[PDB]
Design a protein around this nucleic acid. Structure first.
Lengths: 137, 138
DNA sequence: ATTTAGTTAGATATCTAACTAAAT
DNA sequence: ATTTAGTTAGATATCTAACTAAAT
């Protein structure tokens, strides 16, 4: 089996399983992780470009994702007072409640995954993944 | 220190991007490349649209759209089976075959520059563990 | 004059639900 | 009456290119 096949499938399947679980929250996988990131780093408090950089997503992409979240009233955006170009992002109380609500799912997946592999194997695995991801700049 | 989902997502994304970049000169996408590849390797079996759906782990509509794209590209031909006309058969065109023969080198070159760093033992171990994980999610 | 942050437009990949055509 | 094999419709995610607006 080629590597591309492997990764593209374990990630297609991961995305699918995640969406299946998140169906009761009316958000997608990507929105779930974005919401989570915002949960972690809200206090910073980051612009859209920061999210783009942190997530490996282009500007228009995150613009659409964020406009989606904002339509679901899970986040809020305002213009920075110092740099009118910038758009500062924050979680609303609904967004925060939601993040506190699904987050168990992601952890469930991570656990159900690591339970397949012995800790030495899991550690060597993550190390080799990190190295591979490093290879592609 | 990194969630598995993060690593897999990111890796798949960078692979898809580099692939798309190198494939731009052929005016196809990563997915089209792999589809044409699968056609190349299993054309002989009379691949129905849904057999491709099963093999690529994509859904019927998805496959329909990608195939329709490739057909618009004239890289593939479509016809209706004689034994069962609710089903239609898929085939590589000569343009398509030449294309596959042309770009396969990219997927190989990438798979290569990826495998090389990891020692062949670590490589075997990794493809094995990866297979185990994908097995689990399936 | 350039550089940077965000939005728009056009175009693929992908999913589920609904639908048409046709084997059983 | 019931399944299968593709298509259509409507949706989200993503990227490139061209855009407006705003900072050097």
């Amino acid at each position: 089996f080629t590597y591309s096949y492997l990764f593209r499938m374990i990630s297609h399947e991961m995305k699918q399983k995640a969406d299946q679980k998140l169906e009761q929250f009316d958000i997608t996988n990507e929105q779930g992780h974005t919401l989570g990131y915002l949960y972690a780093h809200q206090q910073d408090g980051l612009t859209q470009n920061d999210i783009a950089k942190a997530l490996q997503r282009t500007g228009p992409t995150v613009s659409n994702l964020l406009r989606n979240l904002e339509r679901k009233k899970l986040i809020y955006r305002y213009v920075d007072a110092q740099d009118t170009r910038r758009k500062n992002i924050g979680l609303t109380t609904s967004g925060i409640k939601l993040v506190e609500a699904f987050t168990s799912i992601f952890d469930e997946m991570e656990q159900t995954l690591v339970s397949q592999l012995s800790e030495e194997e899991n550690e060597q695995m993550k190390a080799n993944l990190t190295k591979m991801l490093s290879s592609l700049q």
